[PDB]
Structures are given as structure tokens and as C-alpha cells.
């Protein structure tokens, strides 16, 4: 890696500067270099890793959807191979970013994560990046969907045993697993059931929270409510 020669602490410092500068490709490269030092990540460092890669793949996914829409419209005047070629280029780069994140999780972030807050976060990330692979998959599509489901399910099982129903990681996991069920697995009723149960169990535990914890949990509950409004 091009970051091998940089101190861990300097890569984390530069990841925070790259986030201020909205330089997300740089931020991801810094955080990849930090993970490759081989030490476990703190909570704040896990959040830097996730912000960096979510912003990089977010741009790729948005671009892929614009190009896939143009391609679908072309296939309903012949304009040649260029729309397909360029959608394929962006797709291959998106797949490559997803494979990079999956490879960091498999070598060796998940296996060295023993605390529920790290293990659930990494397994959610594994589900999310398989989900992004599944969004573009047409060929192993079933096995990619099962890989997303399996990671989300293991994260869910640990989260329900080890975390309160208001824990923001547990909430964001359930939110993203419900999107998986609705958009990827063609299970809208599973999506709606999981969002409603998650919202209701969280609402009944808000009384236990500080004002700051309450704000963190209710922000994510509002996303569950927004999806249930969209879906019902």
C-alpha cells in the first residue's frame, strides 16, 4: 500500500482533514492505510472508515443509476456501445470499491472484533457493501444477495442479544436490513414488519436515555418512520 510509510496517527489526522475538505477518495485511502496497520479501530475511527467509503460508493451508485436509466431508455434510436461501455466502467469501479471494503472486513477487522459495538458495526458494513454489489448484479446475483442477508442476520442476532433497542448502531442496522428486504430481496412485508417493530421497541426505551442519546436515537427512528410512510 502507498500508505505503508505513513504513521497510523498521521493517517487518522489526514482522514479528518480530508473529511473537512470533502475529499472522500483521499479520506478512504487514508482510512484503508490505517486499517492495514493491523490494530483494531476505535469507535471514532470506525465512523471515519464508514463516512469515507459511504461517500465514495455513494457517488458511484448515483452515477451508475443515471447511466443505467439512460441505457434502459436506449433499449426500449441505436447510438452504439458507448452507454453500455461507460455504465460498465462505473460499475466495475463501484464493484472494486465494494471488494476493497469487504476485503478489509475479512482481513481482519471482523475476526478481531469481539465487542458487540465493533462486531455489529462491521457485520452491518459487510451487509451494506454486499447490498451495493447486489444493486448492480445480473449474472452469482443470488449468492451476493445471500451474502448480504447472512451478514445482516448475524449482526441482527448479536444486536438483539447485546444492545438496547435504542442503540444507534442497532437502529441503523435494522433500517438498512429493512431497505435490503424491500429493494433487494423483494420482501416488502418483511421490510415493513422489521421497520415497525424496530421503531416501536425503540420508542418504548427512549425514557431510559439522556437528552443527547435521545437525539441520536430519534434521528434514526425518523428514517424508519419516513420509509414506513413511503411503503404504506
Amino acid at each position: 500500500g502507498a500508505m505503508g510509510s505513513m504513521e497510523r496517527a498521521s493517517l487518522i489526522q489526514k482522514a479528518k482533514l480530508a473529511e473537512q475538505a470533502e475529499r472522500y477518495e483521499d479520506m478512504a485511502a487514508f482510512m484503508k492505510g490505517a486499517v492495514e496497520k493491523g490494530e483494531e479501530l476505535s469507535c471514532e475511527e470506525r465512523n471515519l472508515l464508514s463516512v469515507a467509503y459511504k461517500n465514495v460508493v455513494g457517488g458511484q451508485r448515483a452515477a451508475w443509476r443515471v447511466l443505467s436509466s439512460i441505457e434502459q431508455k436506449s433499449n426500449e434510436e441505436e447510438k452504439g456501445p458507448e452507454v453500455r461501455e461507460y455504465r460498465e466502467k462505473v460499475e466495475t469501479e463501484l464493484q472494486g470499491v465494494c471488494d476493497t471494503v469487504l476485503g478489509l472486513l475479512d482481513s481482519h477487522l471482523i475476526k478481531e472484533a469481539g465487542d458487540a459495538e465493533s462486531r455489529v458495526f462491521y457485520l452491518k458494513m459487510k451487509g451494506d457493501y454486499y447490498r451495493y454489489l447486489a444493486e448492480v448484479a445480473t449474472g452469482d446475483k443470488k449468492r451476493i444477495i445471500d451474502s448480504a442477508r447472512s451478514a445482516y442476520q448475524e449482526a441482527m442476532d448479536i444486536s438483539k442479544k447485546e444492545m438496547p433497542p435504542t442503540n444507534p448502531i442497532r437502529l441503523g442496522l435494522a433500517l438498512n436490513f429493512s431497505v435490503f428486504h424491500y429493494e433487494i430481496a423483494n420482501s416488502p412485508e418483511e421490510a415493513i414488519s422489521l421497520a415497525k417493530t424496530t421503531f416501536d421497541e425503540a420508542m418504548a426505551d427512549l425514557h431510559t436515555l439522556s437528552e443527547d442519546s435521545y437525539k441520536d436515537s430519534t434521528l434514526i427512528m425518523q428514517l424508519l418512520r419516513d420509509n414506513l410512510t413511503l411503503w404504506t
Binding site: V51, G172, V179, I220, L223, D226
Partner: peptide, 9 residues
Amino acid sequence: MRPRSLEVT
């Protein structure tokens, strides 16, 4: 149209 997944800050 598309649902909200976790929005990361």
C-alpha cells in the same frame, strides 16, 4: 421513490 438508508456524517 427510493427509501432512506442510514445517512452517514
